[PDB]
Design a protein around this ligand. Structure first.
Ligand SMILES: C[C@@H]1COCCN1c1cc(C2(S(=O)(=O)C3CC3)CC2)nc(-c2cccc3[nH]ccc23)n1
Lengths: 1008, 244
């Protein structure tokens, strides 16, 4: 299983300096050897074989070089230690013992499987043991994807190798927003190209005035001409002899994209910063690239250890609820227990929910056939049985309270299209915190891997043979047998948001015009919801329409991947649209969501998992976050098998990136252990004492080996070099997070950042903050592409485990309370004046106002936790930074019942004084009127992209957040964005909300 | 046929408030409300789903043949069986309802704070039990290895015990059995450490069942407390001055 802690032994976080080790020799002798905690296996083995001669039967012992050590790990695995350079403290031993053996089997494969198992935090061997044929088929069948991706990486070597390691960090469109192009002088970019000149490594700069649309090759050309030159200058040989890099990080310009399409350059133009690039030779980069080789695993050499159609089964649906092993209820507090069941297609029942008879707590036995108001041939391919054991107590009037105790879901047809038959044993799961509904159709399918839980016995119908779902040819068969005011209505429905009410009339209307629908392909989600899924007649017809259906924009396709669209045909169409239109930029932008909808998939093998894994294996920037989003959820037993198997195939084919990921994983495990000591054994210790322990520990060779010289999990283009130990600190707060500082080891760090600063948090769940910051980045992107420079500065946040995460530390930021502490209301403005004296004042007030407008809109829309002088920070240059978002949507509605939309960010006089440049009567100024306009524009820009936000949130319902559990929870965004209103009424609503919150000041121009 | 004072007409209430009312209700359960956009939306419970049937007026269907809403609802009253009445069915004034609201809101926060505490214990205990099961599976593997070491020592020493007895080397014979004693006593320490963990896990498994029982006991009492609190709040909202 996965290790209980990050400790050096079981129930010992850190081994003492010297430790006694039991050494079980191959001649049956046991030797107790005292070892240093940081001693390597090479050392220990030599010291053991020396001591072994002072012991009986030493004549049976071969040479020390013919043996290796094996022991039991914290993962309960017996691991063979082929890498004898490893340190005792780094072994993850359960008890301090080592067994001497002779290395057997496939050495190369055992080593790789240990590397994979380490990255995933689970032993690869556990998968081999699994009885389920779906699992063993997944493990075997996924290798097609692995092979394919590795082949595409050596298709045009070393270029295709470099394109995998260093993918171009580009926007989705070459087209420039007008506010970006206006910052260009005649459409020309002033770029600084640097050269590291041999042998002394000297830096020579060349300022170039090139066109924004210059492909990287053209940028190299002008630098040649500005150095040599035309009088002897016709060298076209440089095209394939030079490549461009960004100074201070591992971002390369390896692809023919207009320079302006590269995010670093596009950002440089917008901020008016000079792009500092680095010219280097193609060879010096191509020589760094190892040849990545995929090996077919040993399990691919092995195999996995009467039939009727569904449509020829002339009977109704019925399930036999036998009994449940037990339930955890107080017999005096509850009256009776029953099994609530339902037949679902996504989150909608296909027929009414059927309950068993009520029985005593002590007697969970029913032996009851439950009848479903559904004809067996009418059961759709994605149909599921959702059930739960519920308790009931009727003590107040005729009113009775119904509470779920345990739930479970199962696919009625399996991955091979076989309908369920015979007796079935299901271990049920605990009810998710905050869920009050008696069923959990959003929840995962299958038995709880924990067997010390309520087990419900079931039994399905046996039709004397194997019932299999009809083939596509058979389905296409059944489908062959069944004006202007309508056209304006169809377009009107297609514009509406994903969660807008659709009346039965509109459903009958959409289904009637199902063939005209093709003219407006974006109505497909609305049409799929009009289909009667419990009718094989309409479904067969829908299957034929989707088969030829025109492709839609990925932002629309992503919806058909949420829990409301479970049909494999619908999902297949969606995956094809992404394969076609989804850019690597957008895949990177919505990766949190795409990984989340993998949990909604009925089966392990599906088109979504293949598409994602393919892209992860052909783009290392995608591969990095793909791994980190899956690894962070590995502690969660509802997905650990699915995510573990997918992580195994990723790690088997990612090549050299596994070594880099394993260094990140080990750096992270050392940090979890360190903070675990501070939270437990050293919890009741002073800062001075804790810091003394922290500096003494970090100074250890094993700690310095592991926490220096690896890539940042926040951005793999960022290198974490030496730890600046004198800048590292445990924070004064109760959580005790870590501020870690690393030198940027890049040759030209000074042109980007000299130090990389990260807050390491162990204890608080950072998934919600990670999502919130991702939503802000998306909002910031929409705004820029609509021409609004509301500088948000969304810093990095990444969840890496169970309440473990990393937050990028923003430099020269101070909370409004810090500023005020070292007062009147002008204190903030004064602080800003002092830090931006002279010419640079206008820009600082400008920056503070735009970032201020961006945050007013974003926090209002999302309904994040109320803002104050401690969760709002400001940079020296004016840039506002919000931290610690907490809850969002309507978290407060359940707690206080007060039904309304809040204004988390109410601008104080302190904030108004800043925007008004020190003026009296701040709301009257042209500064405040410009700020108001910024807000109005920002609000409408997001409202215009409502479908994207509703979709992004919809793709998270099965994540774990209690304010993001149902569709009725996304309803908040529908109120704040006023989607059931007009663009004018919505703007009036946003204005009234600001007015009521600020007590006047918010005006407008009706037409102006 | 008042059409405003009607029991199934709820007017200005959202789709979500309707979904809460029609949760787990029987086929035929219904209510009418003002549309989300005058216009009226009828919501009918059919097949475990809530169907939205829009009501049109110009003087539901192509020719609107019904004079008023009550006439349309009563005609169909797949049939409009159970109307959700606006009759929940205590205090006459505002000073009494407020004093009761404050009493319930106080109870609600104490129970909620207790539930949250219980949930942290539930989660901590679940994790600890998982940690112990992995540790027992690790002791199991450790014991196997140590036992295999006895088998190996036995397999080898038998031939040397004869070879030293015929040689009368009593000192070397004692060396081998001192090692075997060291090995067997270690297996005893590992076995008893596994034993102590098995009883620690047995106790903690029981402690989990008790936390689970307590939480299933308060979950419906907390839900009902919130429902009464939200009801007293709505009453106080209604029996007070209302405007923009
Ligand atoms: C790393 C970020 C950004 O750069 C500037 C600092 N900053 C802070 C700074 C702080 C402080 S602190 O350091 O005193 C305290 C942690 C010990 C209050 C001021 N909190 C957070 C924080 C806390 C909890 C959740 C979070 N989600 C996002 C940020 C964040 N972030």
């Amino acid at each position: 299983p996965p290790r209980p802690s990050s400790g050096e032994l079981w129930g010992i976080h850190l081994m003492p300096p010297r430790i006694l080790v039991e050494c079980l020799l191959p001649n049956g002798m046991i030797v107790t050897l005292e070892c240093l905690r940081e001693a390597t296996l090479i050392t220990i083995k030599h010291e053991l074989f020396k001591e072994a001669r002072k012991y009986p039967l030493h004549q049976l012992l071969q040479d020390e070089s013919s043996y290796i050590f094996v022991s039991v790990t914290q993962e309960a695995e017996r691991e063979e230690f082929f890498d004898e350079t490893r340190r005792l403290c780094d072994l993850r031993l359960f008890q301090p013992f080592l067994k001497v053996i002779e290395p057997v089997g496939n050495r190369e494969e055992k080593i790789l499987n240990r590397e994979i198992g380490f990255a995933i935090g689970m032993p690869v061997c556990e998968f081999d043991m699994v009885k389920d044929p779906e699992v063993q088929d997944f493990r075997r069948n996924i290798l097609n994807v692995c092979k394919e991706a590795v082949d595409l990486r050596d298709l045009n070597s070393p270029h295709s190798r470099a394109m995998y390691v260093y993918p171009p960090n580009v926007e989705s469109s070459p087209e420039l927003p007008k506010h970006i192009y206006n910052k260009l002088d005649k459409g020309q970019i002033i770029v600084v190209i640097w050269v590291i000149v041999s042998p002394n490594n000297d830096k020579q700069k060349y300022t170039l005035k090139i066109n924004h649309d210059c492909v990287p090759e053209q940028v190299i050309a002008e630098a040649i001409r500005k150095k040599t030159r035309q009088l002897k200058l016709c060298v076209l040989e440089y095209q394939g002899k030079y490549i461009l890099k960004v100074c201070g990080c591992d971002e390369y310009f390896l692809e023919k994209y207009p320079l302006s399409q590269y995010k670093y350059i596009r950002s440089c133009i917008m901020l008016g910063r000079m792009p500092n690039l680095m010219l280097m030779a193609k060879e010096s980069l191509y020589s760094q690239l190892p040849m990545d080789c995929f090996t077919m695993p040993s399990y691919s050499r092995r195999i996995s250890t009467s039939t009727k159609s569904l449509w020829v089964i002339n009977s109704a649906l019925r399930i036999k609820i036998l009994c449940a092993t037990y339930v955890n209820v107080n017999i005096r507090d509850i009256d009776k227990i029953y099994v609530r069941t339902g037949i679902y297609h996504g989150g909608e029942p296909l027929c009414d929910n059927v309950n068993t008879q009520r029985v005593p707590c002590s007697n969970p036995r029913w032996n009851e056939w439950l009848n479903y108001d559904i004809y067996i041939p009418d059961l759709p391919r994605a149909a599921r049985l959702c059930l739960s054991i519920c308790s009931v107590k009727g003590r107040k009037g005729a009113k009775e309270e119904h509470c779920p105790l345990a739930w479970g879901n199962i696919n009625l047809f399996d991955y091979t299209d076989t309908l369920v038959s015979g007796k079935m044993a299901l271990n049920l799961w605990p009810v998710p915190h905050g869920l009050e509904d008696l069923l959990n159709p959003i929840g995962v399918t299958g038995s709880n891997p924990n067997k010390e839980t309520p087990c419900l016995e079931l039994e399905f119908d046996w039709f004397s043979s194997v019932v299999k779902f009809p083939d596509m040819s058979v389905i296409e068969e059944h489908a062959n047998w069944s004006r202007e005011n309508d056209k304006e209505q169809l377009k009107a429905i297609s514009t509406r948001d994903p969660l807008s009410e659709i009346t039965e009339q509109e459903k009958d209307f959409l289904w009637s015009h199902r063939h005209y629908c093709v003219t407006i392909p974006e109505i497909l989600p609305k049409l799929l919801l009009s289909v009667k899924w419990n009718s094989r007649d309409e479904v067969a017809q829908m299957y034929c329409l989707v088969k030829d259906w025109p492709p839609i924009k990925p932002e629309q396709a992503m919806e058909l991947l949420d829990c409301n669209y479970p049909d494999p045909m619908v999902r297949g169409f969606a995956v094809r649209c992404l394969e076609k239109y989804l850019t690597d930029d957008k895949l990177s932008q919505y990766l949190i969501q795409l990984v989340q909808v993998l949990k909604y998939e009925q089966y392990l093998d599906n088109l979504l998992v293949r598409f994602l894994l393919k892209k992860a294996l052909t783009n290392q920037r995608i591969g990095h976050f793909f791994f980190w989003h899956l690894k962070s959820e590995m502690h969660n037993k509802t997905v650990s098998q699915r995510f573990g198997l997918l992580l195994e195939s990723y790690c088997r084919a990612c090549g050299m990136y596994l070594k880099h990921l394993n260094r990140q994983v080990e750096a992270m495990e050392k940090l979890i252990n360190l903070t675990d000591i501070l939270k437990q054994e050293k919890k009741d210790e002073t800062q001075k004492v804790q810091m003394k322990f922290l500096v003494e520990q970090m100074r250890r060779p094993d700690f310095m080996d592991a926490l220096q010289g690896f890539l940042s999990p926040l951005n793999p283009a960022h290198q974490l070099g030496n730890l600046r130990l004198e800048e590292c600190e445990i924070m004064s707060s109760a959580k005790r997070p870590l501020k870690l500082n690393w030198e940027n080891p890049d040759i030209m760090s000074e042109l980007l950042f000299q130090n990389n600063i990260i807050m390491f948090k162990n204890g608080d769940d950072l998934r919600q903050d990670m999502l919130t910051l991702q939503i802000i980045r998306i909002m910031e992107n929409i705004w820029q592409n609509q021409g609004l420079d509301l500088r948000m500065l969304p810093y990095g946040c990444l969840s890496i485990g169970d309440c473990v995460g990393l937050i990028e530390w923003v430099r020269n930021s101070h909370t409004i309370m810090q500023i005020q502490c070292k007062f009147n209301s002008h204190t903030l403005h004064q602080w800003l004046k002092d830090k931006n004296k002279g010419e640079i004042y206008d820009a600082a007030i400008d920056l503070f106002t735009r970032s201020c407008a961006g945050y007013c809109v974003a926090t209002f829309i999302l309904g994040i936790g109320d803002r104050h002088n401690s969760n709002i920070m400001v940079k020296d240059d004016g840039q506002l930074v919000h931290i610690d978002f907490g809850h969002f949507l309507d978290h407060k509605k359940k707690k206080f019942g007060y039904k309304r939309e809040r204004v988390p960010f109410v601008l104080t006089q302190d904030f108004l004084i800043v925007i008004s440049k020190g003026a009296q009567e701040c709301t009257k100024t042209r500064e405040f009127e410009r700020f108001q306009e910024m807000c109005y524009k920002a609000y409408l820009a997001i409202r215009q992209h409502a479908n994207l936000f509703i979709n992004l949130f919809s793709m998270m319902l099965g994540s774990g957040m209690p304010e993001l559990q149902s569709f009725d929870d996304i309803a908040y965004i529908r109120k704040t964005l006023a989607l059931d209103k007009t663009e004018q009424e919505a703007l009036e609503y946003f204005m009234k909300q600001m007015n009521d919150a600020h007590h006047g000041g918010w005006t407008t121009k009706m037409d102006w | 046929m008042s059409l405003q004072d009607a029991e199934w007409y709820w007017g200005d209430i959202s789709r979500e408030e309707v979904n809460e009312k029609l949760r787990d209700t029987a086929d035929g359960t219904f209510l009418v409300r003002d549309a989300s956009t005058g216009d009226y939306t009828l919501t009918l419970r059919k097949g475990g789903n809530n169907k939205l049937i829009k009501i049109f007026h110009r003087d539901f269907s192509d020719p609107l043949t019904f004079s008023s809403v009550v006439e349309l609802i009563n005609h169909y009253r797949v049939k409009l069986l159970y109307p959700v009445s606006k009759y929940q069915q205590k205090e006459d004034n505002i000073e009494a309802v407020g004093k009761k609201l404050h009493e319930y809101n106080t109870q609600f926060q104490e129970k909620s704070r207790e539930y949250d505490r219980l949930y942290e214990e539930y989660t901590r205990t679940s994790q600890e039990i998982q940690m112990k099961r992995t540790a027992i599976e690790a002791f199991n593997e450790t014991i196997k290895i140590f036992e295999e070491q006895c088998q190996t020592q036995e397999r080898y020493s038998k031939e040397y015990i004869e070879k030293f007895k015929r040689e009368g080397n009593e000192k070397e014979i004692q060396r081998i059995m001192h090692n075997y004693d060291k090995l067997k006593s270690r297996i005893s320490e590992i076995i008893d450490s596994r034993r102590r963990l098995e009883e620690d896990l047995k106790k903690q498994a029981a402690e989990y069942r008790e936390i689970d029982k307590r939480m299933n006991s308060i979950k419906p009492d907390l839900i009902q407390l919130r429902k009464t609190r939200d009801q007293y709040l709505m009453w106080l909202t209604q029996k007070g001055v209302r405007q923009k």
